[PDB]
Amino acid sequence: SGAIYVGNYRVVNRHLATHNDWANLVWEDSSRDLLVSSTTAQGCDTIARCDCQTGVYYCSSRRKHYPVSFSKPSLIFVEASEYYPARYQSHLMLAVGHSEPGDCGGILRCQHGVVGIVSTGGNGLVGFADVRDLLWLDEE
Ligand SMILES: COc1ccccc1NC(N)=S
Ligand SMILES: COc1ccccc1NC(N)=S
Ligand SMILES: COc1ccccc1NC(N)=S
Ligand SMILES: [Zn+2]
């Protein structure tokens, strides 16, 4: 689990979105595994606006943060999970690292702020759903 809190937006994995999230939906994209919902309070997080390929991610299944190098957001043929079938998951970044379902929502961060959240795993890779292209998260 885990979320990003930027202004009056809450950013979660679409597959972990709550009823409250769907009842307060701002935007969702199955292809990206992202959902954003409205919030009443303001949030602690700044979104990275950058093309960094190095950062640090939180892995709940290790209670550890790991420094990683990661690929630029791509369309990545992700194998079936319990939430999605095998297709092109878009805006996905891959790194060599451990990942489990309960790790989805872990933050990846660079010097410019939050880059994305854990979305995929398996075979010694971790995939992150990028949020740095969602410029609208910074206003209104
Ligand atoms: C690797 O993360 C950082 C490094 C230096 C400054 C800021 C950050 N990012 C956040 N605190 S979200
Ligand atoms: C980080 O999540 C995964 C790890 C391994 C395989 C699949 C997934 N995706 C899920 N949504 S549970
Ligand atoms: C061995 O840990 C898992 C268990 C089930 C699904 C995915 C994982 N994670 C990796 N293989 S990175
Ligand atoms: Zn950066």
110 is in an annotated binding site: yes
Instruction: Output the CA torsion sign for 74, 49, 9, 97.
Output: positive
Place of tokens 């690292």: 97
Beta strands in 43-136 (DSSP E): 54-59, 64-69, 74-78, 87-96, 107-110, 113-122, 125-130
SS3 content of the chain, % helix, strand, coil (to 5): 15, 50, 35
Active site residue 104: yes
Write b or e for each residue in 38-66: b if 16 or more Cβ atoms lie within 10 A of its Cβ, otherwise e: ebeeebebebbeeebeebebbbbeeeeeb
Q: Which atom of ligand 2 is nearest to the CA of 99?
A: 1
Distance 64 CA to ligand 2 centre (A): 18
Sequence-distant (≥ 6) Cβ neighbours of residue 53 within 8 angstroms: 69, 70, 71, 72
Active site residue 15: yes
Place of tokens 């935007």: 27
The full set of domain ranges for the chain reads 3-44, 45-140
Active site residue 33: yes
60 has which bridge partners? none
**Hey, what amino acid is at 131?**
V
Q: Which ligand is nearest to the CA of 62?
A: 3
- Going by alpha carbons, the residue nearest to atom 5 of ligand 1 is 111
Total residues belonging to the chain: 140
Q: Which ligand is nearest to the CA of 112?
A: 4
Burial (Cβ within 10 Å: 0-12, 13-18, ≥19) of residue 30: middle
DSSP-derived 3-state class of residue 107: strand
DSSP-derived 3-state class of residue 140: coil
Among candidate residues 21, 33, 45, 103, the one labeled active-site is 33
Distance 133 CA to ligand 2 centre (A): 23
